[PDB]
Every structure is written in structure tokens, then in C-alpha cells.
Amino acid sequence: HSSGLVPRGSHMASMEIFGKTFREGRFVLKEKNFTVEFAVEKIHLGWKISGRVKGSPGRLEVLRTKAPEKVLVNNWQSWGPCRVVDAFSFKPPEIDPNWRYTASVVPDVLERNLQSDYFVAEEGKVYGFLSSKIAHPFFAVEDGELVAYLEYFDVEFDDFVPLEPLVVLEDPNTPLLLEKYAELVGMENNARVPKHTPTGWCSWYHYFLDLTWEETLKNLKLAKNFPFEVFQIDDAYEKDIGDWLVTRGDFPSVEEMAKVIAENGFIPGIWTAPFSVSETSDVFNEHPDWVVKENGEPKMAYRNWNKKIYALDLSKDEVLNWLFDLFSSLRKMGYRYFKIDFLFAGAVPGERKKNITPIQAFRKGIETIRKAVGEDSFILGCGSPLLPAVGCVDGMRIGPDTAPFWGEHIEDNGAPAARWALRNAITRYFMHDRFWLNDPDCLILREEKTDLTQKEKELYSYTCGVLDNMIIESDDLSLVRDHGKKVLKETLELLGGRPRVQNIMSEDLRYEIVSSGTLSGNVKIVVDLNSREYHLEKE
Ligand SMILES: *[C@H]1[C@H](F)[C@@H](O)[C@@H](O)[C@]2(CO)C[C@H]12
């Protein structure tokens, strides 16, 4: 009555799991420096590999199989591409040293080989890891083979710790597979998926760093005529990166800002970059030992605001206690919506006080933030590693920044452009209502001080509505007139459904997207991001 299963098909015959022929079973791999105990089990729509590892697994090879020609690949963080690429014509990108870790947490890979983080898909199969709690899970294409790895960053384990589980799903319906992968991720990490999604206003994509409190107050008054729940102050108010409770210019205190917003009937929101401290900040120069190091010196995590930005060492209790105090204080002031940006800084490789992986460090930081703000606060992640944030954040930015222009000829390289922001909202659609609520970035609906056309505004906004994503507007509200108000109202009527991108493996920016059971019934939108055209059907 033996009941173990083995793949029947010829492609699956290439599969090697921890050096073993792929079939159901329990297995052990003993190497010089580590030991893995693992199990392969048949699950609905595929297979699941799980287990435990001890020793020094380093860059642990999990799976090797033949590489498909056309693969949907995924960058580890918000801004980076999720796109279909030819596996064999890859050339190593030039990586800007100011933003190296946005490209990859293991840039040594990306400098030689095509990399995908967390999952990779081909038409009819999905390979995907269900978590990133200790190791960083990634795939590389190495001379025609697709290889799955768990990167432990030289950390040694005296006792067994769990592997990040790997699934291999198979069915002709690729969107279904991605949706089922994401359901498994959500269960593995106890994803937060709020039943209510906030609407709101954000200052960034009109004012940028030039926001003043005078302009903020003008918008706070006008916002009373818009369907906004949250009113969120973005980067501009703070004296420096890390000095979150010190304000600049005409801004009142951080506490005062919250109270003005709340007295005006909005849920107050605030932006921080909580794992980042700039070289000029009070907090860094007061606590130079609080940052990740390289040869005992502070390691640059990225360069922005025209200065070197360092990463907080989230293995340190002093650091976690400082974050806890900060976010507790914010909650006490009345903020209930927190946009937390540049989160990848917390996971940069480097020297930390405790010998834990960068992913373990990251998880401690974001969990600390979660505890501080409480259950009833909404956390929106941004510039963030995706799988390690599941279970912590409520909302997640899943694309590069939008901008007040389309970017018809702008390179797909994670820089701001509405075309690529929207592309990622489409290709990472399946995370929505499974990992978290997807944030496609703000709608820019003004009719002046913008390079966007009316058709572009419609296309972006209606797509986001069909996708049931977060809807946040970012404009000088004075400059939003009848067209912009109408687009918003119509977008909000498209929400509420269960969306699917039906041709997720598309190579030419033309997508067919359906959503069942919206507030407008069943809907379909077909979009072309290069021609900037759409066709929308509503029941
Ligand atoms: C991170 C966010 F992705 C973006 O929306 C905006 O908040 C800024 C402000 O510095 C770029 C950073």
C-alpha cells in the first residue's frame, strides 16, 4: 500500500533537492560543516520541501533544475523590478554604489548571474520560498540551470533551526499558482490583512522636501471635501534622518502636528525611515556604536539627501529600545498610520553586535515597531524586503515610486516613473490580500504642475482600483478640479473585488486584469502601459 509520489514528467526529472533525486520522503544531508534534515511532501498543486539545518550552512544550495527560457523574476524589495526576463540573454547590470543593496542583498550574485529573490515563475510553474526569517532565499541562473539558495551570511547554528520552506507548484494557470503561493506565504507568516483599507492624502508627490506647514494646513482644510481618512505628512518635517522628533522650518512639534490633524477630523499619519541614520544626525553622532559596521567603521547603507546614510544595528537592545520609545511616543501623540521607508537598510549585510543574520536583525526591528505602535495602528512598509515583512506590516509599497510624469522612455531600473510603478502593481498583484494590502503608490490627480495626461491619470487610477489596492492621493488639492475628483470617485467604485492579472507572463506591457465582486460588480480592464490606453468593462 506504498503511497509516496515522484514526478512523472520529463522537465521535473532535472530536479535535484539537496543533491538527491526529487521524490516524497524524509531525508538527511550531512556535509563537513552542516547537516540538513528535510522532507519532501506532495501538496495541492505541487510539492513542499521543509526541514531544519545546523552547523555553518553558509550559502546553502537547496534546489537545482534546468532553467526555463522566460522567467518572472522578483527583486527583494519594494522598488525593484518584478518582470519577465529572458534567462539566457542576461548581462550583469551596472550597480550604482549609492544604492547597491536595493539591487541585491547579495550583489556578488547579481554581478555574475541573473538573480531572483523569494520566488521565480515560468508559464505553468512557480518556485517559491514561504518565508525569510533567518536566511535570505534566492534563485540564480548558472549556465542554464536554475539554482535555489538560502543565504545564512556566515552565521553558525549549534542547534537545528528551521529551513525556510520551498514550494514547487505546477498547473497551466500561472496566476492561480502565484495566488496559491501567496496564500501559503500568508499562512506561514500569519499575514496581516486588514478588512478595512484606509484612503488618504500624502504630501510627497506634490511638495517633496519643499513642503511647509503653511501648505500642509491649506491642504488639511481642503481635504475636508475629499474622501480621505488618513492625512499623512511625508519626508520634509524632520531636521535630519534619525532625528524624528526634531522638526525644521515652520513645522510645529511632532506632537503638535498630530493634534492639529486629529482636531481637523483625520487619522494622523507620519513618514519615517526608521532603520536609517544620517552621518550628520544627532542620533548617529551621539551613538556611533548603534550602526552596522565594516572593519569596525560605520558601513554606508545607501546615499541619499546628499549624504551618507548608515543602518541601525537591530541586534542591539539599546537600538530596539530607542525604536520602541520613538514609535510608542508617536502612538501616544495620536499617530495611527506609519509609512516606514528605506527598510532595506535594516537588512544590509555587515558586522552587528550579535552574530545573527541581517534578516534576523531586520525581523527584530520591524517586530519592535509593531509592538510599539500597537494593533490598531496601520503600518505601511516602503523600500522594504518583502518576505521578511509579512506578518508585521498592514500595507506594503510594491513598486518604485510614481512621479508626475509617465516615463515613456525611462529605464526600468527602480527609479521614479509612473509607468514602472504601475507595472509592478500589476506583476506583484497576487501579494494583495495575502501578504498584506498592496500599495501601488499615490494617485497624482491634479491638473496643473504635472506632466501626466488625463488618460494616464485614468489608466493608473482605474488599474489600481480594479486591483483593489490602497488608494492614497498626493496633490496640492487646490489644483485638483472636476476631472481629478471624478477619477477618484470612479476609482473608489472599482474597489472590493478579487483581482487577477490573466496574462501575468506578458512581455509587452499589455495586461488583461479582471476583478470579481467589486462595488461595481465584475469588471475587466485591459491596459497598455506603452500606448497609455485602456479599455474598461463594468457589469
Ligand atoms: C521613500 C518613499 F518610497 C517615497 O514614497 C518618499 O516617501 C520618499 C521621501 O524621501 C522617497 C522616500
CA dihedral 274, 276, 278, 284 (to 10 degrees): 80
**401 annotated active-site:** yes
Contacts 24+ apart (CB under 8 A), 80-83: 80/400, 80/414, 81/412, 81/413, 81/414, 81/420, 81/423, 81/424, 82/398, 82/424, 82/427, 82/428, 83/412, 83/423, 83/427
Rg of the chain (C-alpha set) = 23
**508 annotated active-site:** no
Nearby residues of 90 by Cβ (< 8 Å), 6 or more positions away: 113, 114, 141
Helix (H), strand (E) at residue 473: strand 471-473
| Residue 509 burial (C-beta neighbours within 10 Å; 0-12, 13-18, 19+) | middle
Q: What one-character DSSP code corresponds to residue 351?
A: B
Q: Which grid coordinates belong to 115?
A: 538573480
Name the resolution in angstroms.
1.5
Task: Among 102, 204, 305, say which to mutate for ligand 1: greatest number of ligand atoms within 8 Å of CB.
Answer: 204
Instruction: Please say whether the beta carbons of 370 and 377 come within 8 A.
Output: no
Of 341, 433, 439, 441, the active-site residue reads 341
Instruction: Please say whether the beta carbons of 202 and 473 come within 8 A.
Output: yes
**Residues pairing with 74 in the sheet:** 82
Task: Among 304, 382, 444, say which to mutate for ligand 1: greatest number of ligand atoms within 8 Å of CB.
Answer: 382
Cα within 13 Å of Cα(90), Cβ side = 25
For residue 341, report the distance from its CA to the centre of ligand 1, in Å.
6
| Residue with CA nearest ligand 1 atom 2 | 341
Indicate if ligand 1 lies below 6 Å from the C-beta of 475. no
Indicate which technique resolved this structure. Answer: X-ray
Q: Which grid coordinates belong to 407?
A: 516615463
Instruction: Please say whether the beta carbons of 441 and 399 come within 8 A.
Output: yes
For residue 400, report the distance from its CA to the centre of ligand 1, in Å.
10
Taken as a whole, the chain contains a residue count of: 539
Where do the domains of the chain lie, and which CATH numbers do they carry? 1-171 (no CATH), 172-496 (3.20.20.70), 497-539 (2.60.40.2760)
End-to-end CA distance of the chain: 52
Q: Which grid coordinates belong to 112?
A: 555574475
Q: Identify the three-state secondary structure at position 364.
A: helix
Q: Identify the three-state secondary structure at position 145.
A: strand
* DSSP count for the chain of H helices, then E strands: 12, 34
For residue 219, report the distance from its CA to the centre of ligand 1, in Å.
19
| Residue with CA nearest ligand 1 atom 12 | 341
What separation in angstroms does the CA of 505 have from each of 156, 373, 410? 39, 39, 22
Instruction: Please say whether the beta carbons of 526 and 535 come within 8 A.
Output: yes
